[PDB]
Subunit: 238 residues, 4 copies
């Protein structure tokens, strides 16, 4: 399937590893130029080397940035604009009795992470994409988590409604269980066997499997799709 | 229907007018003692006089408080505890290209309004209600608005799950169009005719109509209901 | 709370036992005259007797009727009209799909056709029947007793879940139409409520998985955040409220009544 | 993107025109062999000819069949098996309920029974039929073409919405069962997509409200945030992706493809 992505410029946040990284791969495969970023500069360099060597015809800008900080995010965007003159795709992918436990500071702190992180990065790409009349934004979306994720889901709806007139489409993807660094991490922090028993597919998803969907949403082929959140979860949501 | 509310202590935020006020009325009618609050002290005194005179057998504590400020909210709760020794009910009711328009400050500011406002007031009543083994919390729940409301809806789900074991039930109610001060306000800021045409009931709801539901959720009769958000909207959500 | 129900005429289908029976009790207690029904005569008489003796101040009409059959359902409504001249409240409550098989390919057309000709058409038909009556008087309440499988379908409930989703959508569409006539249509999704059908459901899934009802119950309970199975009285409360004058601005919605089951 | 579809055998129901036809084109283009069908012979031949000439490298089998009838649907699958020995992809696509009447009380049992015996049982039956086939080979994709009325029901769509909600629930339940067999079941809800049925829908609602199709279209458009009606190609893209090896971790979901209609 021709996805019409040749020479599109894709900013993928959190692309030094896991889902972010595979997405970057898959976009370069469709012929995108990339902006990959992350805060670990060494992790990112590795990502960068691997990418450049697999995709020698594609431009790849690497920028060390924390997309939870305002200044870094503005510079990320301005640096990408300086480099390519356009940004066509944004994949927002950054990190997310008990309840009565959580202070005001604890709540404000998670709002100023990924919540405000995705909103701000969106705000920042919107004028560029509207100018181009071409845009794709894919948000990669557990009490604190669920509140932010619900907020993001509705943010997606409302922003899609507004920018659809400019062919700037915005959607979200909900991972179930995906074999990423954090996950081989946060089950060595056999237990896996108990998760498999909860996934109707009896199997954990690959980052490749996850990326396939994001790339399709980021393509020309998805031109009539906007405002939706799609679970990618091996059937967990059944 | 006997709602089992005799001598229950109900904190109703925003009860100097509109929905908040009618809820307070309806709770006193079922035999609750009240804590009513608001920032307009004069509006609140009027509410208070009207209440006291309609319900002379019921205790009514009035406290001037902004339930969007941390300090006011802690004092509101501690003042109510000092007065009655318990708080049985909490009704959280406080006030809620364009998008790329909104700054980080603009977003953080609305998070620190009603979003954090309901979460904090909940956190603050939870230990009291758990101790009593009896609790009812009803959250009265448009881009900024919709994001906070989505966040609150999911917050409701998660907190209900956690405190259900203590018979502290928490639910939410979504108003459609209700004839409140703000609404006779924000359609004189005939236009009404265009809203009626959107409400399948061809009529705007009364605060009485709205309160009936909240009071039922706040009652003993609702002992098996928790974690849900109910629209009260004359059929708008059809 | 005054529900404004004194002398309303209420038809509760499947009211000889379980959820429907307790709803009828509670509507009687608010001052309604009832029409109650069931398929088994002896059960129904037992329910009628208990109601008549507990609420002798209220008229109660009991009719043997299968509200999955058109004839009986048409007759039910006419007999209710001949007696009372009006019907103010309908509670659609009747048996949903059986618990025998859930493996999908193994279900034939016939098994689906029956499903659809049961509770599904049952509630729609009875709704079509009471609508003109409620409309002409501009007062009407219909409460569909559905099931949470309609929202979140379960392994033992493929058929049931399909029926329930459908009825949840029907609810919205009809509420939209009748709204301007003060005829309000809502639905309630019981989670797990202690009735004969639930106890029968326990009995047999134990036998089938080679365990006891008790351990089945224990399992269910671990999934309910309130850690208990609801009572028919707890469930009737909400149904009675929705059937009331107090619910006058609520239409088109389906509410889970489930001890938090939906929040888990 | 390589979709991994080379030599998959795909059955697209209702493929002589509109959404189904464009899906078939697009599956052919990815390297699938097709089974296409319809009720009208002359239309079908026209579709077959166009496909055969456009994609002569691919086997195409065309059969006249009403996939609302059990006989024809059973025969369809056997004829498909006799030809290819396997079926890898099913796209459930057939006519839903008529646009004539939406006022509810005015719909009889028979009108509902037909509804339920149409697209509703049609998709369920055909699903039951292809399931063992896909299961034995551990590869299967089924994509149900439903409708947004299933999520958000509309005044001109009471019946349709009821059917669609039901099918959306069916989707979840069957996906859960077949998931471990790498047989994936999803659904797509078209918003407004420019087909013969949509143009026919325009024609007649104009006539009925005493306006022109153009002004009906203008009205629809004002409600679509993209301010345009979708193309069958735009819609086929997503269906083809879901039928693909690339969609290997997606099951049990229904996706709106609607130019933002759901976000409004
Ligand atoms: N994995 C899963 O199954 C699930 C994932 N999600 C969500 O999907 C997204 C992907 O997670 P996953 O791949 O598992 O996580 P990983 O931690 O495995 O990968 C995260 C990647 O993003 C980078 N990153 C993280 N934070 C920032 C930041 N603030 N600024 C710039 N780069 C950042 C990391 O590099 P560095 O640390 O160097 O910046 C790394 O490359 C997350 O938002 C997560 O919340 C949600 C539910 C389940
Ligand atoms: N009315 C409607 O149709 C809709 C309402 N809602 C929500 O329902 C709730 C009720 O709104 P409604 O009655 O219309 O609003 P009104 O402004 O009519 O009434 C609000 C009441 O709450 C008080 N109040 C407001 N803010 C605070 C605060 N920060 N601290 C303490 N008291 C406060 C007000 O008094 P004072 O100003 O003196 O504090 C007043 O008594 C709101 O949260 C609103 O967002 C949502 C959608 C529609
Ligand atoms: N109990 C629960 O936890 C749940 C209940 N539900 C739903 O709630 C409703 C009530 O269930 P429940 O109270 O548990 O069931 P019970 O079997 O315990 O009670 C059912 C009552 O309805 C009568 N009845 C059943 N079908 C018909 C019919 N076609 N015509 C007339 N009367 C009928 C029965 O009498 P007779 O057999 O003699 O007619 C009996 O009086 C059902 O729709 C069920 O699907 C859904 C999910 C969970
Ligand atoms: N177009 C839209 O915007 C929307 C479409 N949908 C749904 O999407 C699907 C496709 O609709 P659309 O492409 O617009 O319809 P069209 O009528 O334009 O195309 C339908 C095709 O399917 C065939 N067909 C219809 N019913 C049957 C049957 N029982 N057996 C075999 N073939 C059949 C028709 O041929 P013949 O008549 O000769 O059999 C024709 O080839 C339908 O399920 C519809 O309900 C839902 C909402 C909106
Ligand atoms: O799934 C639902 O909610 C149902 O409608 C079916 C049902 C009926 C009775 C029970 O005891 C359990 C399940
Ligand atoms: O409501 C839906 O989504 C449907 O399934 C019915 C439908 C079918 C074709 C149309 O052109 C419009 C509506």
């Amino acid at each position: 399937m021709d996805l019409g992505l040749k020479d599109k410029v894709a900013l993928i946040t959190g692309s030094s590893a896991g889902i972010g990284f595979t997405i970057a791969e898959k976009l370069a495969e469709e012929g995108c130029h990339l902006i990959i970023c992350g805060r670990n500069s060494q992790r990112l360099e590795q990502a960068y080397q691997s990418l450049a060597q697999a995709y020698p015809a594609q431009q790849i800008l690497r920028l060390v940035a924390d997309v939870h900080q305002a200044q870094d995010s503005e510079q990320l965007i301005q640096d990408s604009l300086n480099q390519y003159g356009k940004i066509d795709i944004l994949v927002n992918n950054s990190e997310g009795n008990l309840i009565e436990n959580l202070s005001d500071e604890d709540w404000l702190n998670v709002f100023q992470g990924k919540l405000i992180g995705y909103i701000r990065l969106t705000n920042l790409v919107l004028p560029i994409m509207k100018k181009q009349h071409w845009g794709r934004i894919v948000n990669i979306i557990l009490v604190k988590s669920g509140v932010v994720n619900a907020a993001l889901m509705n943010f997606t709806k409302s922003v899609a409604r507004q920018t659809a007139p400019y062919n700037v489409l915005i959607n979200s993807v909900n991972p179930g269980v995906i074999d990423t660094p954090r996950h081989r991490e946060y089950l060595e922090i056999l237990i896996r066997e108990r998760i498999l028993k909860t996934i109707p597919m009896n199997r954990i998803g690959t980052t490749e499997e996850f990326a396939n969907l994001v790339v399709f949403l980021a393509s020309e082929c998805a031109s009539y799709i906007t405002g939706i959140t799609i679970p990618l979860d091996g059937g967990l949501s059944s």
